[PDB]
Amino acid sequence: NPYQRGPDPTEASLRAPRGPFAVSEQSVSRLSVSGFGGGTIYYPTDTSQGTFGAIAISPGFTASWSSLAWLGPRLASHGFVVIGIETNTRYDQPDSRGRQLLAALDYLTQRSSVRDRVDASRLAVAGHSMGGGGTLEAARRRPSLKAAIPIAPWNLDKTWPEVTTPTLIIGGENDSIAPVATHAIPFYNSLTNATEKAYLELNGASHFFPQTPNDTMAKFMIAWMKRFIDDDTRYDQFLCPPPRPSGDISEYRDTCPHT
Numbered sequence: 001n002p003y004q005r006g007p008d009p010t011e012a013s014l015r016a017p018r019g020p021f022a023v024s025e026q027s028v029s030r031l032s033v034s035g036f037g038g039g040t041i042y043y044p045t046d047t048s049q050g051t052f053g054a055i056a057i058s059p060g061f062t063a064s065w066s067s068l069a070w071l072g073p074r075l076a077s078h079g080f081v082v083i084g085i086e087t088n089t090r091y092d093q094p095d096s097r098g099r100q101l102l103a104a105l106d107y108l109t110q111r112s113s114v115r116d117r118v119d120a121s122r123l124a125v126a127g128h129s130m131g132g133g134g135t136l137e138a139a140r141r142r143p144s145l146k147a148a149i150p151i152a153p154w155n156l157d158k159t160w161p162e163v164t165t166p167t168l169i170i171g172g173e174n175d176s177i178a179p180v181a182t183h184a185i186p187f188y189n190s191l192t193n194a195t196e197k198a199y200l201e202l203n204g205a206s207h208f209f210p211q212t213p214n215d216t217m218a219k220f221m222i223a224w225m226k227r228f229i230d231d232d233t234r235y236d237q238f239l240c241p242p243p244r245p246s247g248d249i250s251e252y253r254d255t256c257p258h259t
Contacts, residue, residue: 003122003230005049005079014222014238015215019078021046026113030086035103037086039065042076043114053122053146053229054081056104056138058097060129060154062090068128070213071221078222080229081118083108094130094155098137101125122146122229126221128210129154129178136187139165147228149221150187151210154178158186166196166228170217172205173250188253196255198224198239203250216248227258 006020013019021044030038044052055075059067065084072082085104087097102125109120124147125135132153139148140162148167152175171184178184180201188199200220202209210217219238226235240256243249 001231001233002050003053003119004232004234005052005230008234009223009226011219011238014219017074017213019074019222021049021077021079023073023076025072028083028107028112033107035106036100037088039083039085039104040069040072041108041112041114042072042082042084043117044076044079044081047117049079051119052079052081052117053124053225054083054105054108054118055124055126055147055149055225055229056101056108057082057084057125058087058101058127058131058134059085060127060131061092063128063131067211071126071210071218074213074218075222075225078226080225081108081114083112092130094133094157095137097127097131097134098125098141101127101134101138102142124148124225124229126151128152129207132178133157136160136163136167139163139167147225149224150184151217152178152184152207153187154183155187158183159190160187161190161192163191164193164195166224167191167194168198168200168220168224170200170202170220172202172207172209174204175207177207194255196228196258198242198255199251199253200249201251203246203248
């Protein structure tokens with residue numbers, strides 16, 4: 001596998017604050033950019049290992065990138081390029097958030113200083129709340145995307161049969177802002193055309209679980225990104241067979257096996 005990066009994973013390294021790769025960050029101004037409000041780019045410092053896949057991450061309603069900023073160095077340290085975006089306006093709806101995520105992936109691959117590092121063919125989207133609804137809208141508009149990770153997603157549109165991208169939805173059991181019964185689970189069941197999908201429900205988690213570092217969220221986010229952006233079968237272990245409910249995991253749904 002030419003896309004394979006890093007040593008054979010361990011559970012502890014997945015929960016660890018940093019993966020093996022050293023990371024560097026580049027700021028992006030709102031004025032220097034078209035289609036979104038700017039953001040921050042996190043990348044592996046090591047030129048030698050090879051080009052790396054990339055993920056664009058969007059915050060929710062009224063929030064800035066800093067509300068999810070811990071994800072940038074954590075994900076990138078495992079061998080990915082991350083662009084965390086600021087929105088055009090803080091009142092942007094999920095549909096607008098999805099198009100801005102796509103514009104951020106365009107800026108990163110086409111114009112950014114780190115474009116040579118990124119493999120433009122292997123890209124993904126993630127987001128929190130309306131940003132989570134946005135990653136579904138981005139996956140709808142760009143089926144070439146390799147992975148999609150809505151986190152506590154919020155969207156009025158409940159039906160997503162157009163998505164073919166492997167999608168992992170992460171929900172909080174006790175979420176009252178975007179309740180999983182009305183948002184996350186309807187999204188999951190409607191993804192009748194996703195090549196693979198999974199639903200991860202975090203035990204006793206409020207809507208704001210992504211605003212703080214959470215090892216279980218990071219572990220499955222990294223394993224999904226490795227499996228589908230990098231085609232890395234070494235990480236399928238955590239995804240399949242499916243995890244059973246535990247201290248952090250109240251419920252898990254999946255489409256195992258991953259063929």
